Write a protein that binds this ligand. Structure first.
Ligand SMILES: O=Cc1ccccc1
Ligand SMILES: O=Cc1ccccc1
Ligand SMILES: O=Cc1ccccc1
Ligand SMILES: O=Cc1ccccc1
Ligand SMILES: O=Cc1ccccc1
Ligand SMILES: O=Cc1ccccc1
Ligand SMILES: [Cl-]
Ligand SMILES: [Cl-]
Lengths: 259, 260
């Protein structure tokens, strides 16, 4: 039988490992191994976002996960939404541990501009945040901008193609988070030798109301990927609205990178 | 269309409000109101159980929910597993805000023995902890016993009839918790005038492998209820394995306490 892979799955800001609860057993049934990483101050991590002052601190559970893998293991590393930035930071540290980066409705940064660049671009044109609550927290690293999604904004812009159960679950579990745009705007640029050396593919939802298709085409065009896979009918939260189709995309990526 | 109700849902130890994710929209699509409480150091509360040292602190979010209800509003208060102890404590405080207590696969304490009684009986009786991790934490008032379920134990004893997705979900959400056995042993008995005065019913899973159906009978004999409802094929996590049947039982309860 064909060889299986280890998928490492990285959630979006304000969410947690829990988002992967449908996708994980589909991947595992097909014989793959799955690690759903919980980022700092995410999901059931008992540590408020206010204690996680930088994007490196936020990402630390992923970096520790890659550090821990046995020698020469390579993973399919999937970053969702803000998880794109996480996986890019991880790839600049452990590029030989990554078979392919999977940017899933994700921020795809480049090696040319400041790491916040594609975030800053989206925020300029974002549209409505609805009932989302914005606040600040002062730190020895500067001021952190925090966000807590509002329920209307979740329903209209993230979860509009999800079953009602999933939306309810999300209301029970979403947390105050941050997109670390200040921290990102002054980090060093991602390197060509680390991040830039790693194979990458982009998986996009057709109905993502957060990360629209034109913005995606722009990021890709700014920083090329080897292949693009589309999920027809996916909302932003495509692991909840179309997990089977997400599984199909990841399965096509595992075949395409089985060498 | 006759009166709908406000259901207040109280989760078990080591879990959180998220367990009710299937039940809540069922109740709500039938016109009822639902509050799924999140107890201290549970679910997404960024506070470790070690910091919550007493059952009264654990239960505070429930107390604050009840306290904030409008004057004369009464709720159907559902307590799942250790949630039974929480709802009894709440009923000892605010009996007049509770139309009926629903003990769902729940510890059902009495008004004769110390509040830990039924918990101590289960701990003496139960042989199936498997890979669960027991540990202690010392407080200034004494030892606090803690527990963190193991995934084999979850699969065999709580979730054995749940969809695989729900078990995966629980693995990414459950937390170290506590049954507060030392603290409950030191508390005053539940009262006949508060808790004892509130109507109570019992809803049981026919396949509960953690609170065995015989142990449930022993509890009910020990401290009777008005009515027992049975969910055929439920595991302990019956809001995940048989949510529609649970919905049916709580709708039947809602009918039997229709508001004259
Ligand atoms: O896009 C945000 C939003 C908020 C409330 C209602 C509808 C949309
Ligand atoms: O609309 C307010 C706001 C605050 C911080 C970042 C983006 C928007
Ligand atoms: O460095 C930031 C900070 C935040 C809260 C308390 C103390 C320091
Ligand atoms: O819900 C029952 C239970 C029992 C032991 C540990 C956690 C939960
Ligand atoms: O089996 C029950 C038990 C209780 C506390 C510590 C160890 C075991
Ligand atoms: O209840 C725990 C358990 C542990 C190993 C195998 C089967 C059950
Ligand atoms: Cl995000
Ligand atoms: Cl419990």
């Amino acid at each position: 039988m064909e060889r299986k892979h280890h998928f490492v799955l990285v959630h979006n800001a304000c969410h947690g490992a829990w988002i992967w609860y449908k996708l994980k057993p589909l991947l595992e049934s097909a014989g793959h191994r799955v690690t759903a990483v919980e980022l700092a101050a995410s999901g059931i991590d008992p540590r408020p976002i206010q204690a996680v002052e930088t994007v490196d601190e936020y990402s630390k559970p992923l970096i520790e996960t890659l550090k821990s893998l046995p020698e020469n293991e390579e993973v399919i590393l999937v970053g969702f939404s803000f998880g794109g930035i996480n996986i890019a930071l991880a790839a600049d540290i452990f590029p030989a541990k990554i078979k392919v980066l999977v940017f899933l409705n994700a921020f795809l940064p480049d090696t040319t501009h400041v790491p916040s660049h594609v975030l800053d671009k989206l925020m300029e044109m974002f549209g409505g945040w609805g009932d989302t609550e914005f606040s600040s927290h002062e730190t020895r690293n500067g001021t952190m901008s925090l966000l807590k999604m509002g329920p209307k904004f979740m329903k209209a812009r993230l979860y509009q193609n999800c079953p009602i159960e999933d939306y309810e679950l999300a209301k029970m579990l979403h947390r105050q988070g941050s997109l670390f745009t200040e921290d990102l705007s002054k980090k060093e640029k991602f390197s060509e030798e680390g991040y830039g050396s790693v194979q990458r593919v982009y998986v996009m939802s057709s109905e993502d109301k957060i990360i629209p298709c034109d913005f995606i085409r722009w990021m890709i065009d700014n920083f090329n990927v080897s292949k693009v896979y589309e999920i027809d009918g996916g909302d932003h939260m495509v692991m909840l609205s179309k997990p089977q189709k997400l599984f199909d995309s990841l399965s096509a990526i595992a075949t395409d990178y089985m060498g």
